[PDB]
UniProtKB/Swiss-Prot annotation, chain A:
Known function: F(1)F(0) ATP synthase produces ATP from ADP in the presence of a proton or sodium gradient. F-type ATPases consist of two structural domains, F(1) containing the extramembraneous catalytic core and F(0) containing the membrane proton channel, linked together by a central stalk and a peripheral stalk. During catalysis, ATP synthesis in the catalytic domain of F(1) is coupled via a rotary mechanism of the central stalk subunits to proton translocation.
Domain of life: Bacteria
Organism: Chloroflexus aurantiacus (strain ATCC 29366 / DSM 635 / J-10-fl)
Residues of the full protein shown: 111 to 160 of 164
Family classification: Belongs to the ATPase B chain family.
Listed name of the protein: ATP synthase subunit b
Length: 50, 55
């Protein structure tokens, strides 16, 4: 049972590592896509309620 | 003769009881050691199984 729990935790830890790697990759890619996209209209979003 | 016979019978029973108790004690101790070795050996095999599963 201890071995089985270890495999479950190992897969879970691998899942967390994969999620973190995917988040970092998205952040790097999101920066590239946003720069080529431009951010002209971001100011308009700051006064929908203020 | 009666006193010697009573004393001899009492001595013989005690010696027989002492011998049987020692024989049981030695057998139990050896049996306990054998069980501990098997349990110890099983622990090593479990560790190897756990290590293989981790890899």
């Amino acid at each position: 049972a201890q071995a089985e729990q270890e495999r479950i935790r190992m897969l879970s830890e691998a899942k967390s590592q994969i999620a973190d790697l995917v988040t970092l990759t998205a952040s790097r890619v999101l920066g590239a896509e946003l720069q080529a996209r431009g951010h002209d209209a971001l100011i308009a979003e700051s006064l929908a309620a203020l | 003769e009666q006193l010697a016979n009573a004393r001899r019978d009492y001595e013989a029973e005690i010696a027989r009881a002492r011998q049987e108790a020692a024989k049981i004690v030695a057998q139990a101790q050896e049996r306990a050691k054998q069980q501990e070795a098997e349990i110890i050996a099983q622990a090593r095999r479990e560790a190897e199984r756990l290590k293989e599963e981790a890899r």
